[PDB]
């Protein structure tokens, strides 16, 4: 009777916006929502040699990509379920909904 929502994005602000919208939707109705739980961040790190040739001192680049995640639990109520189903997420945010 509860729904679990998973959010992931490379931009922290958009994630916060979506989470706040869900929180407000839950607030505007009588329904208990477990707060947005922050899960560990994904870091993708790649180290590469700089020069195209092999002459000279060896120097390296360290490129990094970060992926932030959130978790929300809410009880399945159709009055609030439709509202969150109609929210529009930005293109850089991934959302997944499942019933437990």
């Amino acid at each position: 009777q509860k729904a679990r929502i998973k959010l992931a994005s490379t931009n922290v602000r958009s994630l916060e916006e979506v989470a706040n919208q869900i929180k407000q939707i839950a607030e505007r109705t009588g329904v208990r929502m477990s707060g947005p739980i922050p899960l560990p961040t994904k870091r993708i790190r790649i180290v590469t040699r700089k020069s195209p040739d092999g002459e000279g001192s060896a120097t390296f680049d360290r490129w990094e990509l970060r992926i932030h995640k959130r978790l929300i639990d809410i009880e399945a109520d159709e009055r609030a379920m439709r509202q969150i189903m109609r929210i529009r997420v930005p293109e850089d945010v991934t959302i997944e909904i499942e019933l437990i």
Partner: protein, 55 residues
């Protein structure tokens, strides 16, 4: 058939089974998380993919 004297064998492992999707080079291919790019090509397209040099 004369066209059979130009086709390559379908290898599944070895240095000849992987080519850069941007320049076609064999050798130093970055295979991390499904990327298929040379170390040369990755440096000049990394910002477009969202990578940054934080430290």
């Amino acid at each position: 058939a004369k066209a059979d004297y130009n086709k390559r064998k379908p290898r599944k492992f070895g240095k000849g089974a992987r080519r850069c999707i941007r320049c076609g080079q064999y050798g130093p291919i970055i295979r991390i998380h499904g990327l298929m790019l040379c170390r040369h090509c990755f440096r000049e397209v990394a910002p477009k993919l969202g990578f940054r040099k934080y430290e």
